[model samples]
Target: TPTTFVHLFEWNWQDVAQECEQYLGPKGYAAVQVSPPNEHITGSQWWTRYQPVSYELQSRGGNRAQFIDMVNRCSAAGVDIYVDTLINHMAAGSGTGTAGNSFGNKSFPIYSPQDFHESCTINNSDYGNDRYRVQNCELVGLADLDTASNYVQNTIAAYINDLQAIGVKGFRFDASKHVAASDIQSLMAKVNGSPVVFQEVIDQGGEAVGASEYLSTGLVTEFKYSTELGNTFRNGSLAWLSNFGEGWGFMPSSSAVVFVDNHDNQRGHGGAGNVITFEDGRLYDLANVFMLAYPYGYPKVMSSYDFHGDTDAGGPNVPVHNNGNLECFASNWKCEHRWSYIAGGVDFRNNTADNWAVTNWWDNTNNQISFGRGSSGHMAINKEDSTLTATVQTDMASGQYCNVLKGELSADAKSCSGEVITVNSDGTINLNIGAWDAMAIHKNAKLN
Candidate 1:
């Protein structure tokens, strides 16, 4: 089965280990996008992770030992760790950090004033026009690195190499758009392993740094993908999602890593608040399910803690294990992955991966739509305010199959715990879709 990446934001390394063992590993999640592993600015605030004072593997997330333990355990559970590497900059303000590492007060061993760019605030007008300023200027007053320098390049690469030596498989390159593409590529060339990089180049058209420019370096975060999906499902049209990627100006599925919403955006930071999040409830689930069912880019799911008011506020000072109870929603952890509908969609995606040909696509005049994934699966969604009845194409073998979004397959895989649907000899089905409703069925859950 194809796997998904879940950003377990600000979760401790010990908690990450338990999550991989108890949920992510048991389910089909491929990797955990752990928060920045480097030492950061001192505080309980979330933004501190983005401000690195040193490359030491100690911070609010955990000490060196715990991170290694998580990597080893998650690997044994068939999952990998993808660290959020904050190599593009150092702390914006002078202070000792959560890991007790200090910077900016004086010249440090790895870096000095000469290693940093001359402090200058960025102007929005320069984004699409000036590459030099975009790469060298401080982002929102933070200290930017002199990426072109060999000493600076070697130091940053060594941090990633150290993680690779500890069994880390990939990275989410933080603030990568601020670094020159050539500098980033040259640094990537030094890593011992060809580590998977999901560079966070937040380009939403007309930016000096477009994600397409970084395709050769590695996969770029498709920020536009989330915004468009959110708008379509919120007020636009759902029918057009059938031809989502190329038609919608998105990078090819092979070169993009997409999500419906991210931690920063959901909280109104880093181009925040234009996308749908777990806070949007059922619509959020529907959008995510559509992303999974559609044959598009590699998808990432956002797992968050309950945060409101202050966007920069830190995570709960407690452990993510929730007293050894995995019921995340009932606790501080808002485990959207455990939601039956979304998890079911994950199963549907795994079953239908690489089957790109869409069959039986029906887009009604209204916001109601239906489609089939090659012959392996089918989906029906109604966003209008009334019930809908249509003779839809199931595009599957004649049998009784489990509707994954609304139900579950039994232990024997012979029957479902939810409503069952029958497909006729001609691969057709009678669908009774309700308002704000969605349904899915796949071959692997079919009852013979």
Candidate 2:
């Protein structure tokens, strides 16, 4: 419950205000990790936003004033800001900044225009010669940065530290793998002492890189859990994730950040194939409920808009380089954040924060699961075809009682009267659960 972070992806300053004031804050979302507010390559491509152009706060989302206003706005609403910091690189093929500033052009610093000053071309050619170039290497020819450079470090550090000054609580280190581990540690150390950060390290099957690099500095996005979730959600050693955790490939509660799907993945970006999104409502509800209900690392819920692609980005990518061009569509970007189940799930998390681990495990195996939260709140779920009956698992001095979700019940009532059933002293309970319907019982029974 304490781990409440919302991925406010590609949302504008004005909309963010509406979200925080109208929904996110009132809905009890503890923090919001907003889309990168900095100026970047101007295009409909989702990755373009990740391809930043400068340290100045200017982009399709908002400008400097709008950025500050958003930080203040969300902070005022009690929702802390966690910025998406793309410090690893700048715009590569775009050739120009979002504002049409000709960047990395002829006669700038010690670089040329071929790949937007990204040193990865050099690193790929020579991975051994320069570790600095490797750290600032152009990933897929994307503009890489000298994050270790004193000048670059001080400038970018100022850019992020200022966010902390303006009331931002944390940041998301985009493309952290390309950036050196030591560089991240040093950067985090210098960035306003320390801010809550979660690096987007793409470590699936422990192949790409290790998560331990950034764990000591801040929380690392546990990308490996996606594959594990896919396996377990379908079929794995840990099939029943209803009470899922550690064994399911999740890091400790403090060092990991988990989500069903993100903006990029929803649009079929990196790690596109092996994942799930809100598109599958039933599975999404199951996954989210399980994520929040189970004991794991920090959890983030994605709020998105309807986009063109099933797992595609908000808009189409136009080639801005060789006959490459894109248009400005203000009403674009999928609004995943507004979906009903996704929105409702955030509320459920807030209401049942005290409900830590699932209690009273009463599952009939056919996709139905039910449990209680200590003594304060109780819950029962039924997605099974056949009715489920079990010994009521809670201490209530079984007698004449009212079912919170159903109605009043006689102490020894053998049958469930319209979903309301009584539990006897022996703890035997008669329950009638309709197909596909879930029943959540609570301590507040008298109202029935």
Candidate 3:
């Protein structure tokens, strides 16, 4: 079964369609989360998309027609698009739209009934003081609408339905915690049945306004997964992954979306803490590969762009600023899904039927981690300070084994010698790993 959905952050509709068609679809990615499709004009920086303006299908990236074309094309290619719906609030309610928007009339767009003209208090008023007000009050002084109102609900529902009609398999609900619980339920109920909502609920510890509340209504984002990933893959301590997602208190399996690092945190927009991103490139492969080996909740890989230290935008082709036409991410995009261990892990899972479980767990606890996948797969990781060699346990059946990442694996591993370890008739396996290196072997791998 398809268990992972990747976010092609800030990718323009056209490029997204192309990526889905060219790379993701055939490679087996289940869903692609595109940027907000509604008409929003966040300026300069990328977080503006976070500050939504209207439900119109026109926006910085592309117009309504392009979105539909992309979605339809990708769907036809076997990949489903998941739209990022930002119905939480409108523009910060202050900036003037250079594009000449009619809604820019009173600093709060007029056509947007959700925009409060008289109550457009940037400082203090209704939701200014109370926690629930933050939930229902003016967002960052931006006109916050009463989502409970039928007008607002229908407008959103119709927009979402239109998307669903265009092959949208799910939604990445932005700032869902800001709306009333009832409104949240109504909005979800109004859309695709079972709606598939991955609301941006950053309830790390599930403290105030816990994410569980959202789970009670619809799927919520799991921030803890990233935190736990960072801790376990450290080479110092990551043993429990054979039993991951336990202490995290995540939703009962289906009512949540799990991601290592999303656009917001990577760019320092929101929920920044105990999180790791491309910055952890040193150990990224292990982190992702391990996540793939274990069958947990829905996992999402961040298809991100290279950026200045906390800069969060689409990519090299796109400007750092949020306003203006979107550019196709060229070399600037990291495309983590293209990594060897990652790509192979995907193959291994689909090929193995995902029934194999991690066994014979072993870790250097200082800078190494390795494990076996019962009968199908076995991998060893070495991140030690110096080159080291050890005869670790493995499950390979003797022969010229292949280390897919190493490009070739053959050295008489019989004495099964090779970059890959060979399982002896008696079960003892021999391995030799380089410093800061990772190697894996499959049951029936052939020599190069």
Off by over 4 Å in 3: 94-100, 105-130, 231-236, 240-242, 248-250, 271-274, 310-314, 318-331, 386-423, 426-429, 442-448
Write the residue-wise lDDT of candidate 2 on 245-298 in tens digits.
566565666788888777766665555555777666566655565555444677
Per-residue lDDT of model 3, residues 341-389, tens digit only? 6665665555444444567778765566777776676777776777546
**Model 1: runs farther than 4 Å from truth?**
270-273
Q: Model 2's lDDT to the true fold?
A: 0.62
Per-residue alpha-carbon lDDT of candidate 1 for residues 384-425, written as tens digits (9 for 90 to 100): 898868889766898888989888888887879888978889
**Where is model 2 more than 4 Å wrong at Cα?**
105-118, 121-136, 235-239, 272-274, 310-341, 351-355, 386-392, 395-448
By summed lDDT, which 10 consecutive residues of candidate 3 come out lowest? 409-418
Report how far residue 383 has shifted in candidate 2, in Å: 4.1
In angstroms, the error of model 1 at 10 is 0.9
Q: Where does candidate 1 clash, by residue pair?
A: 127-208, 128-208
User: What TM-score does prediction 2 earn?
Assistant: 0.78
Better of 2 and 3 by lDDT: 3
On lDDT, the leading prediction is: 1
Judge candidate 3 against the unseen true structure and give its global Cα lDDT, from 0 to 1: 0.66
Clashes of each: 2, 19, 9
RMSD of each: 1.6, 7.5, 5.4
